[PDB]
């Protein structure tokens, strides 16, 4: 999973390096071809069949990169689904928490033993569910489970007192229950809430960065087809005028430097995705 993610971005970075090396080699060949200012047909049909090779390989590399990007998106979606499940479990635990608090209020406001017993029954069911509602060997996790064990034990004590008609002892047991709950489960609750908020923020920023990365790839792909169109609108037409030629000679330089700006942006985005993922 995480190791697979690290391997993907690693190999995506490697593909990026290969496509920037191929581009700079093509630029060097074009420069060395057109410094001499040779209008021979053989050199054009060969030193631009150099552009043809670069585009054939670079396009295959782009296809591999697109497949890797789709796999990366699938893994990110799996991570987001795991975070969604954890948030749902946290919501269930908070619901059980609210049930416990409501029934503690009811016990405080109660006057007879039947109301106390009913509230304690609801508390016991909520505490059992909350203990089970957890996604895992951290010390806080163990303290949470042990605290719910003690909490259900205190519910047992309060129920035992209530079944004997001792309402005041039941309220006292509920107060000790509140103290135990605060001392044991509150820290885990705070940690889970903080983790869920941080994960929501991370999800938002990763949705933004992935969108930017997909846009960068599609933009680079659009530049590549423009490169082929320009080369053969100039290749097959066997152009001869030097002014028409020079103009193209710059068009491609500006297109190549724009592709550089795009490729370095892709590199920095991939480095960002790695840092945020570890």
């Amino acid at each position, epitope marked *: 999973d995480e190791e697979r993610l690290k391997e993907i971005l690693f190999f995506l970075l490697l593909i990026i390096i290969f496509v920037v090396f191929l581009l700079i080699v093509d630029y060097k060949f074009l420069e060395e071809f057109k410094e001499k200012n040779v209008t021979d047909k053989e050199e054009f049909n060969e030193v631009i069949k150099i552009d043809e090779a670069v585009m054939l390989i670079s396009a295959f590399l782009l296809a591999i990169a697109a497949a890797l990007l789709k796999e990366l998106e699938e893994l990110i979606r799996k991570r987001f689904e795991e975070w969604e499940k954890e948030e749902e479990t946290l919501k269930k635990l908070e619901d059980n928490w609210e049930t416990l608090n409501d029934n503690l209020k009811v016990i405080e406001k109660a006057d007879n033993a039947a109301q106390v017993k009913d509230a304690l*029954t*609801k508390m*016991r*069911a*909520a505490a*059992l*569910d909350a203990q*089970k509602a957890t996604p895992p060997d951290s010390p806080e996790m163990k303290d949470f489970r042990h605290g719910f*064990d003690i909490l*259900v*034990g205190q519910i*047992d004590d309060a*129920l*035992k007192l209530a*079944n004997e008609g001792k309402v005041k002892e039941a309220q006292a047991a509920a107060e000790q229950l509140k103290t135990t709950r605060n001392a044991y489960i509150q820290k885990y609750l705070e940690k889970a809430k903080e983790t869920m908020e941080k994960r929501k923020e991370i999800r938002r920023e990763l949705e933004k960065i992935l969108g930017v990365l997909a846009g960068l790839y599609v933009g680079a792909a659009f530049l590549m087809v423009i490169a082929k169109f320009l080369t053969k609108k100039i290749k097959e037409e066997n152009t001869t005028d030097k002014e028409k030629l020079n103009e193209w000679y710059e068009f491609v330089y500006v297109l190549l430097i724009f592709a550089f700006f795009i490729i370095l942006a892709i590199a920095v985005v991939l480095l960002k995705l790695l840092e945020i993922l570890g």
Partner: antibody
């Protein structure tokens, strides 16, 4: 090395009478298991009658039988007793005695893992 | 007082037919629901506890599931020794024990 519960003392009795059912436990002691009495009327379903926790002395009763039955225990001889008083026509049933572990852990979650053979009361 | 409503009150099935028994709790009892099997003239024995945990020695065909206050017992392959009365029982607390009405699976 077999955990079992054996019921005794049940049988035919006149209405309004008194009898002490006994549940003797072997393979385990009472002090770490609450003992519950559960009755099944002829052709009906199961119904929980009472329980006793000898560790804390707590006893609880079904509403249909509260005030008439008295559940007690003797850990020295490892037995539970149910004194049935003021018997009526709806008290005829097969009475089973079951063990239930204490909170927390698997013993509590296993519920009535072992049941007695049950004795008939008429 | 927690009611534990069991359906159906009785079902007829043959050997191999999948059997499903459903129980509804009048209020949340967590997963503190157990399924017991009872033969005619014998004491109930524990099949499932914690509403999904299979007791030791029970064939793995028996299974239990929970969905809110609904609890389901499933016999995947009804064997000839699987005809009996099955009881859902909530055990939230010692004094709050209530049983289902019982489903009489017969061959």
């Amino acid at each position: 090395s077999e955990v079992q519960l054996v019921e005794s003392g049940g049988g035919l009795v006149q209405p309004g009478g008194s009898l002490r059912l006994s549940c003797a436990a072997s393979g385990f002691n009472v002090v770490d298991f609450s003992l519950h009495w559960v009755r099944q009327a002829p052709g009906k379903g199961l119904e929980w009658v009472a329980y006793i926790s000898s560790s804390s002395g707590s006893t609880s009763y079904a509403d249909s039988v509260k005030g008439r039955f008295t559940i007690s225990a003797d850990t020295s001889k490892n037995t539970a007793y149910l004194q049935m008083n003021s018997l009526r026509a709806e008290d005829t049933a097969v009475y089973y005695c079951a063990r239930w572990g204490y909170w927390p852990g698997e013993p509590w979650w296993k519920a009535f893992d072992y049941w007695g053979q049950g004795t008939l009361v008429t | 007082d927690i009611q534990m409503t069991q359906s159906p009150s009785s079902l007829s099935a043959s050997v191999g037919d999948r059997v499903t028994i459903t129980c509804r709790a009048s209020q949340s009892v967590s997963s503190a629901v157990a399924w017991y099997q009872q033969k005619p003239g014998k004491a109930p024995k524990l099949l499932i506890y914690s509403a999904s945990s299979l007791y030791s020695g029970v064939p793995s065909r028996f299974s239990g599931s929970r969905s809110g206050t609904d609890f389901t017992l499933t016999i995947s392959s009804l064997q000839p020794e699987d005809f009996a009365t099955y009881y859902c029982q909530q055990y939230l607390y010692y004094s709050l024990v209530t049983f289902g009405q019982g489903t009489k699976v017969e061959i």
